[PDB]
């Protein structure tokens, strides 16, 4: 639709403007809860990994985190022009850009892919390529859910708007066993089941 | 930190002084929505869904990043010219999908705790620099105000196992060579 906006970087108080490096960061963060019912705008002014000044919508005014930016926070509160839009950015930026998340991000569903492969005995149930990164993966052995011999790696963010996880299982092969791997995910109305049989 | 159902980063303004380089990007739940090419003045969305329904003016970045260049020279003089501590990065190489000896796949090289954001990633196949089929994402923010970058390599698995991820950073004494085969 219309052009979106972002956090407004307030101006500093100075009188105008391995190798060494000076890094300056600024993050316009926003924390939504229960849809658009509990929006919280928290802008962070960071200098060399050290956050020295921040704004909070729950507070309403700028504050200095470290003794490095009292001159910035106290000056950013004095200017009525700066504090006027900074308070209004939660409605201008976040509460507005969140409405496009419903149309795009928050409606995105991706069905994962489940494969069981031994390693030679460790069994690996690899759930791959899914969204929105909410899954419940369980290992079973003939109607009984294994737990003690199951390794669960954390969620792996692939960076391409997909996720990946690996749930492993140590086992003793007994003839007649059937090792199913349940995978519960929002995009799936019914869970994906992949089995591995004990034979020979 | 703060507990919430969703966390969006509609700033992620970056500007360092080592090499006059910057980066503007929006992030939702850890993933990058887009990044503004500060040289070509273009908004590069990371999903086709965004290119058909989203919209963003790259001028906002140039207007915003210019403020960082002012605030950078500001806090440098207030902090007695305090440099940035070179944190030690760590590399983890894995695959996007279970690799089979015939069907192609995508290799992923994750580099975490990148600070300052001056890092390189080059793939090494059998000691040679693999150039065809290499992609990397822009710097992604972390809670501790560091960064992490992910690199990719489109390949087809075979008998060749030499698939390293050369990562050179100031926090490291020697360049790291992390190779992993499923």
């Amino acid at each position, epitope marked *: *639709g*219309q*052009v*979106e*906006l*972002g956090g*407004g970087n*307030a*101006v500093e108080v100075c*009188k*105008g*403007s391995s190798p060494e490096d000076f890094v300056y960061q600024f993050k316009g963060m926003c924390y939504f809860t229960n849809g658009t019912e509990r929006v919280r705008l928290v802008t962070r002014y960071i200098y060399n990994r050290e956050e020295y000044a921040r704004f909070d919508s729950d507070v309403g005014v700028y504050r200095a985190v470290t003794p490095l930016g009292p001159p910035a926070a106290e000056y950013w509160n004095s*200017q009525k*022009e*700066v504090l*006027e*839009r900074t308070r*209004a950015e939660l*409605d*201008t*930026v976040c*509460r*507005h850009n969140y*409405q496009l998340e419903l149309r795009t991000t928050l409606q995105r569903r991706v069905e994962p892919t489940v494969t069981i492969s031994p390693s030679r005995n460790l069994l690996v149930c690899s759930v791959t390529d899914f969204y929105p990164a909410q899954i419940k993966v369980r290992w079973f052995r003939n109607d009984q859910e294994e737990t003690t011999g199951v390794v669960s790696t954390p969620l792996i963010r692939n960076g391409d708007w997909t996720f990946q996880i690996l749930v492993m299982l140590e086992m003793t092969p007994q003839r007649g066993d059937v090792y199913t791997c349940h995978v519960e995910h929002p995009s799936l109305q019914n869970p994906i089941i992949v089995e591995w049989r004990a034979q020979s | 930190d703060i507990v919430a159902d969703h966390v969006a980063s509609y700033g992620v303004n970056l500007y360092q002084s080592y090499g006059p380089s910057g980066q503007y990007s929006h992030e939702f739940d850890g993933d990058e929505e887009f990044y503004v090419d500060l040289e070509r003045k273009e908004t590069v969305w990371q999903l086709p869904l965004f290119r058909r329904f989203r919209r963003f*003016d790259p*001028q*906002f970045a*140039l*207007t*915003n990043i*210019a*403020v960082l*260049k*002012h605030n950078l020279n500001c806090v440098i003089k207030r902090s007695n010219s305090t440099a940035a501590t070179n944190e030690v990065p760590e590399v983890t190489v894995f695959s996007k999908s279970p690799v089979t000896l015939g069907q192609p796949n995508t290799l992923i090289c994750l580099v975490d705790n990148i600070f300052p954001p001056v890092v390189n990633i080059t793939w090494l196949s059998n000691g040679h620099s693999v150039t065809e089929g290499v992609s990397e994402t822009s710097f992604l923010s972390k809670s501790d105000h560091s960064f992490f970058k992910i690199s990719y390599l489109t390949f087809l698995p075979s008998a060749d196992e030499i698939y390293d991820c050369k990562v050179e950073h100031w926090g490291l004494d020697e360049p790291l060579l992390k190779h992993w085969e499923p």
Partner: T-cell receptor
Amino acid sequence: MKTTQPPSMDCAEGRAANLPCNHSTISGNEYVYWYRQIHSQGPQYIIHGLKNNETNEMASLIITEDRKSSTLILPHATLRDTAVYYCIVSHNAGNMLTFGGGTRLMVKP
Amino acid sequence: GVTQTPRYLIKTRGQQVTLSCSPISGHRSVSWYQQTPGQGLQFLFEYFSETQRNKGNFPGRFSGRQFSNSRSEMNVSTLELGDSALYLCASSLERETQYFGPGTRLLVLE
């Protein structure tokens, strides 16, 4: 422009001057600004708003809850309030300032 | 308020013009505009920290400059008949509300 205004507007001196403005295509991130200007002279900032009704000591501005339209209200229109009033929208993000047709207000004494 | 000099100016073809503007004390975002009856208010370029943050679609003959004390300047080269206008100066705190100055009424004649 993303706004529209009536160009023919006059009212009696001392009485209220309600200058309307319609901006149905405005977004939740665009402010509403009002500028007046005597020709051959620099424009003058009056008042700006996003939500609710705001009042500067020069004039008041009301915005409908649906944000479709807004009106600039002058309490007691004097002879000096006879310029051309512009109603514009802005992102307040270092963007440009674009004017439209405006409203040529004439204060009949 | 916003100081802008000179007030009036009469030039001919081929000459050049250097316009100056002192913004409001505390402001450091100077925007330039050209106001004509046939083109309305057209954006020129904006200077913030001695750099050109935003720029319109005007030829290279329209250049600008800014100093440490936030005072900005604007130069035009090879003036044409269509360049005669009221050149306005908008002082802004940063990205907030812009306050215009008196303006320089320029006139180019043969």
